[PDB]
DNA sequence: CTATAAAAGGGGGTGGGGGCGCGTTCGTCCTCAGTCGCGATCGAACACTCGAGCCGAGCAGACGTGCCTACG
């Protein structure tokens, strides 16, 4: 669920930045060095298992719809987020958060 | 202990008042036509002169009538 999105968006940004670099004048081997060392760093971080491998706190970043406060109680309407928990990573697109302050 | 409510303090915004600067209007300046005083000449009248002409007086005389004497 995570490497599928990572492969799709890394090939998306590669096939978009091809014209960006060749309109800024550099060799295609420089583009290849970008993608190659970028997957080297995904090897180095050692959190998700994928392709180039076979060849600090818990932060959740996201977006919100509404944060509601009924006096003590908080209600979070979070959406489109990438969680990093227990070392590993997960994705979500919706989250309801009940919070006692 | 944590949450909610109420109270107090601080900050911001709006309104009012005061001060300063722009604006207005009449008292004070600025010509300019109509008229006064004086020389300046001009026309009308007035005083003086001078001669032309007429009139009266005056005087010498003539042209007559009457009135009176030496000669035939």
Curated annotation (Swiss-Prot):
Binding site for DNA: 68-69
Record's comment on post-translational modification: The alpha and beta subunits are postranslationally produced from the precursor form by TASP1. The cleavage promotes proteasomal degradation.
Superkingdom: Eukaryota
One Pfam assignment: TFIIA
SUPFAM superfamilies membership: Transcription factor IIA (TFIIA), alpha-helical domain, Transcription factor IIA (TFIIA), beta-barrel domain
Subcellular location per the Swiss-Prot or TrEMBL entry: Nucleus
Family: Belongs to the TFIIA subunit 1 family.
Function: TFIIA is a component of the transcription machinery of RNA polymerase II and plays an important role in transcriptional activation. TFIIA in a complex with TBP mediates transcriptional activity.
Binding partners and assembly: TFIIA is a heterodimer of the large unprocessed subunit 1 and a small subunit gamma. It was originally believed to be a heterotrimer of an alpha (p35), a beta (p19) and a gamma subunit (p12). TFIIA forms a complex with TBP.
Record protein name field: Transcription initiation factor IIA subunit 1
Species assigned in the record: Homo sapiens
Gene symbol of the encoding locus: GTF2A1
């Amino acid at each position: 669920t995570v490497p599928k999105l990572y492969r799709s968006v890394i090939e998306d940004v590669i096939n978009d930045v091809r014209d960006i670099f060749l309109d800024d004048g550099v060799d295609e081997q420089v583009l290849m060095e970008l993608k190659t060392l970028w997957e080297n760093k995904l090897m180095q971080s050692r959190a998700v298992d994928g392709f180039h491998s076979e060849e600090t706190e818990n932060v959740v970043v996201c977006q919100y719809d509404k944060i509601h406060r009924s006096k003590n109680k908080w209600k979070f309407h979070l959406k489109d987020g990438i969680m990093n928990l227990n070392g590993r990573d997960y994705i979500f697109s919706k989250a309801i958060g009940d919070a006692e302050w």
